[PDB]
Amino acid sequence: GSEQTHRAIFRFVPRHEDELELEVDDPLLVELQAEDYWYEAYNMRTGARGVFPAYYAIEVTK
Amino acid sequence: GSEQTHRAIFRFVPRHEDELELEVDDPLLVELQAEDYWYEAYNMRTGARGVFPAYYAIEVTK
Amino acid sequence: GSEQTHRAIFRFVPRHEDELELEVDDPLLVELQAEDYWYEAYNMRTGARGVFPAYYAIEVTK
Amino acid sequence: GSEQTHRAIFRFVPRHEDELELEVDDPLLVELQAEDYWYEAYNMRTGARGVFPAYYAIEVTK
């Protein structure tokens, strides 16, 4: 979809090229699964895309 | 020191060469706690060295 | 239904008799999503049925 | 009373006697981090005491 799917809960500052920087409460759009325990997403606040540790975000209320 | 400082609470599978693999409850000797929220540590179970997202581990208690 | 509906993302060790024990990645068949934010499900790995805090599992990515 | 140790990230409505009700963002003073992944704590907003699933809260003051 095009709507927010997750919200970051921990600050994440990249050290690697493919990573997505996160600020607490950052809205995230995740569209694929993980397996690696890493999520690939679009940060709706910064407009950047990349991966981050899966447990650094929570699915938006259901 | 050389005693456990933290315990992993989330599974972490390295995606990058410098990362440290973690399994929940792994005893960790955290040596570096960096400004960018990445921690450098020795995994006391596996014997490996590497970095991982800071919030994947919590300090030991008691 | 007879195919996985949700995936457990945190380990959950029951403290009460009606709870369903969970291990990360456990394939769950959620049969009821209660209004008090607890899910009733069948654990496809253990063959047991029980309840657990709703946020311990996420819907599978179709 | 000591200082806040954790913050609730998920809504938790008790179904059992000994449980502590949580609202997202509730300040928590965790007195015991049990080995069965349940936390015994004081809810600094409601003033209540009880247990809750460990992964429903995150540590503060990293």
Ligand SMILES: OC[C@H]1O[C@H](O[C@H]2O[C@H](CO)[C@@H](O)[C@H](O)[C@H]2O)[C@H](O)[C@@H](O)[C@@H]1O
């Ligand atoms: O293994 C996935 C299926 O698990 C259940 O069904 C099986 O488990 C039953 C008892 O719990 C057995 O009697 C049956 O023979 C097993 O195949 C579930 O009911 C199915 O819907 C799942 O696909």
